[PDB]
Design a protein around this nucleic acid. Structure first.
Ligand code: MG
Ligand code: MG
Lengths: 77, 76, 77, 76
DNA sequence: ATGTGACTTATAGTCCGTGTGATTATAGTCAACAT
DNA sequence: ATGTTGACTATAATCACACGGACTATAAGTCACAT
């Protein structure tokens, strides 16, 4: 659909694997459906900031460092 | 209320103000609704990334500089 | 594929719903995959007695009462 | 070892004996392997439902009477 | 006749993911009247 | 100009499930030698 989204979902998946988490853990750890997390990662979802926040607490990562990785992903080529 | 959600709004307002833009104008520019934008700016809406993106296009700021600012604001 | 199996999986699903459990409770409660329970219930699986035992403890049901329902299901026309 | 698994085997042995069948004969009759049946009967195999079903056909007993017996045996 | 041990292969059981239909909560959009 | 209040609809988010490919553990099936 949209630029920022595909970047957001790329970063969530990048962190998650970096931390050796499976989708499963992530979903409990961050209080969303197992399906929701999957659906984000197939970039098929446009999440709310509140949800983003919950995912960030899920990845055990600070808002700051998350956005620092966003920025970097946006910049690749 | 959410901490992040409130810094995002603070920033939107900040950028709009640095640009001497009214809400009415931000709403026109981004094709969203004045009542919408008002609501965000008093932190009474929790917006979807897509909406954020539309507001960024209206402020006329790149996602990169938006998040650069957001980080700065978050850090106090 | 086989007579007894379709009867066994019919009974597991019958008890589970009777107890208002979803597949995933069942799967944790009984220490098997979420997928395994599903696959049994689509009667696509031929389980070990040990696994059966684990499912029975899962449904919070005695071996006895389980087989009493087997018998009844085998009998139904 | 499993309690159920051991009553199942006890029963198989019981039915075979009430029929005066040898293992060799139960193996032939059910098209499985003598060493397989031996192993079950000293509770050293944890068999699939399918196999159980094969052994039941070899004993020549209906699932219904098998489980009737299994319950009785379970109850001590 | 039965028991045991060792070995191979077929498949039970595990683990991590994709995809979806149905339902509930809430964001996305707008009117009215406010200042 | 901005703020606030509802009502309306579109979709974010939830909940019970099915299905898949890849992988590990173990049952299913045979010999060998045993008694
Ligand atoms: Mg929840
Ligand atoms: Mg386990």
């Amino acid at each position: 659909e949209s630029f920022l989204l595909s970047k957001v979902s790329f970063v969530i998946k990048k962190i998650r694997l970096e931390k050796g988490m499976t989708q499963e853990d992530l979903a409990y750890k961050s209080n969303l459906d197992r399906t929701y997390i999957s659906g984000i990662e197939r970039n098929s979802r446009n999440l709310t900031i509140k949800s983003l926040e919950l995912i960030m607490k899920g990845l055990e990562v600070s808002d700051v460092v998350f956005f620092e990785m966003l920025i970097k992903e946006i910049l690749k080529h």
